[PDB]
Amino acid sequence: RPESELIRQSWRVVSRSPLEHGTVLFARLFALEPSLLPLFQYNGRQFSSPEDSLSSPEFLDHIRKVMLVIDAAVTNVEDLSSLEEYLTSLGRKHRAVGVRLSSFSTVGESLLYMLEKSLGPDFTPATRTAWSRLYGAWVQAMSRGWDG
Ligand code: HEM
Ligand SMILES: [Xe]
Ligand SMILES: [Xe]
Ligand SMILES: [Xe]
Ligand SMILES: [Xe]
Ligand SMILES: [Xe]
Ligand SMILES: [Xe]
């Protein structure tokens, strides 16, 4: 694969500082879909504004969890079949949390944004297309958590 290499190279840059980059991803997500904010309920409280999420230790740990799941996806970029069962259960957890399957396209737009801003002229259209293909495959697997 050539596009497997485009993924791996772009990711190594982002992986150097995962919380900084993850923070961009979530900041963008809340700018596109403010209704995701109430779904992060850490002992029964709701954030009022997006900037409130940024002071919460549990929210920042969730960013670290996200970036580790993406890192896994990258590691297994050839064959994502090995992650399939874990992603199905991860999707089910998110369904229980209140996330709708439609919102994972906003998530995908926010990932591409973060990549585009981070890599600048290196975010070529082959790499965008590569990441978009990977994410489409990652979402397919996750979406089994909503039944198929
Ligand atoms: C799109 C909106 C999302 C919302 C509202 C959301 C919300 C949550 C919440 C409430 C939890 C439970 C509390 C916690 O562990 O921090 C959770 C767990 C988790 N999230 Fe997310 N999340 C989303 C997206 C993602 C994405 C894109 C990933 C990874 C690519 C991710 C990875 C995880 C992981 C690994 C856990 C721990 C699950 C377990 O093993 O129990 N989440 N998420
Ligand atoms: Xe944020
Ligand atoms: Xe923010
Ligand atoms: Xe954790
Ligand atoms: Xe990471
Ligand atoms: Xe993601
Ligand atoms: Xe991904």
Swiss-Prot record:
InterPro entries: Globin, Globin-like_OT, Globin-like_sf, Globin/Proto. Predominantly expressed in brain. Residues 1-147 form the Globin domain. It catalyses: Fe(III)-heme b-[protein] + nitric oxide + H2O = Fe(II)-heme b-[protein] + nitrite + 2 H(+). Induction: Up-regulated upon oxygen-glucose deprivation. Keywords: Cytoplasm, Disulfide bond, Heme, Iron, Metal-binding, Mitochondrion, Oxidoreductase, Phosphoprotein. Heme b binds at H62, H94. GO terms for molecular function: GDP-dissociation inhibitor activity; heme binding; metal ion binding; nitrite reductase activity; oxygen binding; oxygen carrier activity. Coiled coil: none annotated. GO terms for biological process: cellular response to hypoxia; oxygen transport. CDD domains: Ngb (cd08920). Its EC number is 1.7.-.-. GO terms for cellular component: cytosol; mitochondrial matrix. Phosphorylated during hypoxia by ERK1/ERK2. Phosphorylation regulates the heme pocket hexacoordination preventing the association of His-62 with the heme metal center. Thereby, promotes the access of dioxygen and nitrite to the heme and stimulates the nitrite reductase activity. Phosphorylation during hypoxia is stabilized by 14-3-3 proteins. It is an enzyme of class 1 (oxidoreductase). It is found in: Cytoplasm, Cytosol; Mitochondrion matrix. The keyword Heme applies. PANTHER family: BLR2807 PROTEIN, NEUROGLOBIN. Monomeric globin with a bis-histidyl six-coordinate heme-iron atom through which it can bind dioxygen, carbon monoxide and nitric oxide. Could help transport oxygen and increase its availability to the metabolically active neuronal tissues, though its low quantity in tissues as well as its high affinity for dioxygen, which may limit its oxygen-releasing ability, argue against it. The ferrous/deoxygenated form exhibits a nitrite reductase activity and it could produce nitric oxide which in turn inhibits cellular respiration in response to hypoxia. Monomer. Homodimer and homotetramer; disulfide-linked. Mainly monomeric but also detected as part of homodimers and homotetramers. Interacts with 14-3-3 proteins; regulates the phosphorylation of NGB. Could interact (ferrous form) with G-alpha(i) proteins (GTP-bound form). Belongs to the globin family. This is Neuroglobin.
